[PDB]
Amino acid sequence: KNEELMLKRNYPRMATKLYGNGIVKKQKFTLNNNDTRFNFQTLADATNYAL
């Protein structure tokens, strides 16, 4: 060969792709303490309901 091609370079080529963000999602639940006690007859069933 030309034998000075030993001096020549060869870089890697690197295909990429850029991604945006995700989204934050939420949900809520309201549990009261006086009117939902009327329909469980034990504390254990009320705690199982809240869980």
Binding site: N34, R37, N39, Q41
Partner: protein, 51 residues
């Protein structure tokens, strides 16, 4: 005729008031909705005519 008028004290008189029925205060646990109550109706004995 140029001085600010001086308060001397503020009292905040106060007494607490009772209940006259506080020995009826029975304490349950706030579960369920309804509560029923019942007695046994009477049943008089009978003569037995063992014929």
């Amino acid at each position: 005729k140029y001085l600010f008028p001086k308060i001397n004290e503020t009292l905040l008189i106060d007494i607490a008031l009772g209940n006259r029925f506080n020995w009826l205060a029975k304490e349950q646990d706030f579960i369920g909705q309804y509560s029923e109550e019942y007695v046994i109706m009477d049943t008089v004995p009978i003569n037995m005519d063992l014929s």
